From a paper:
We recently discovered the cattleyene synthase (CyS) from Streptomyces cattleya and studied its cyclization mechanism through isotopic labelings. Some polycyclic diterpenoids have attracted increasing attention, e.g. gibberellins are phytohormones derived from ent‐kaurene, while phorbol esters exhibiting the tigliane skeleton are currently in phase II clinical trials for the treatment of acute myeloid leukemia. Their biosynthesis is attributed to diterpene synthases (DTSs), the type I of which catalyzes the conversion of GGPP through diphosphate abstraction and cationic cascade reactions. Substrate ionization is mediated by a Lewis acidic trinuclear Mg2+ cluster, bound itself to a highly conserved Asp‐rich motif (DDXX(X)D) and an NSE/DTE triad ((N,D)DLX(S,T)XXXE), to which the substrate's pyrophosphate docks, with assistance of a highly conserved Arg residue (pyrophosphate sensor). Here we report on the crystal structures of apo‐CyS, CyS complexed with GGPP and Mg2+ (CyS‐GGPP‐Mg2+), and the CySC59A enzyme variant.
Residue numbers in the entry: 12 to 363
Write the structure that this text describes.
Amino acid sequence: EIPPRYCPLPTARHPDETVLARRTADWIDGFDLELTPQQRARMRGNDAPGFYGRIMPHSPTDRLQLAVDWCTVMFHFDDVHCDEGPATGRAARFADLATRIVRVLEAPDARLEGPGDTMLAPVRDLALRARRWATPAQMRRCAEAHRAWFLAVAWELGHRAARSTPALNDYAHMRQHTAAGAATLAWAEIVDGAEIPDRELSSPEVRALTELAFTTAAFDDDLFSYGKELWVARAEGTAPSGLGLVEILRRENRCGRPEALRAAVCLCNRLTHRFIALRERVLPDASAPLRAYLDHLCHLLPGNLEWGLTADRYRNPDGRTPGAVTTTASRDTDPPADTSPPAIPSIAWWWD
């Protein structure tokens, strides 16, 4: 199913996944989400502890709980508040809820609860808990990373409402944001307990590294969730969504499905190799917090792959069919023969 991914990076699991799973489930249960057992099962299928624990396998358990908890509520946000509710006024309802969430991260006692709100109390709890470990610059990074995610989701809902297919150039730099890469990883330096110097985090080389890691992970997410996209489309009697690297290359190259999967993986291999090569040049002068950051990006790439191929989120999607979708993967041990920049301008500067 998925042609050989080049990813010569070790992957490891956090030893306290079970503890994290238990507290996560308990923590999200103490608000007012009114979670059905079906909903609690899908959350288990999301394996938030397995996902973040692979990003940070050596982190202390009580601090990792912060990042894990966030994945918990943002899987629920993703599945209940993204592309759902009435089609009439759908964009307005998203943007309204998105800006509330950002504000609560900036001001936990803003009290922006509307009628029937159940996505702000846990976000507030996360903000309050994040203000006990994090520097001001850190908090600011979480808010603005949430803005980047949500602006990209507004972009995404436009395409879903039109069933359009984004051109490759546009998708190639937007996908890191619809995937919430930066918002997902911004918790890591808070868990680590040391501020990454803004001067480093803003340098062009680190920005390339950052966007390489998040784009790669999101393209992989597109790969290991392709089956689900095919299942959903088969169930709903529609064509697969254009919001996905495979379908975009299909439409762009007027090719068949297998050719598109090979092209998608070829691209992923080139991004991954570029990320590794650029990491080599950056490491020597890297402060310890930046090194740690690159360490988490390095665990993210193979960790995301292993999570996505094994998590029930993408195998038993509705929560009632064990093995409806099965997805295979290989590891290509050879680096890509072509190390030059792809013909995708919106991202070419990563090879600068």
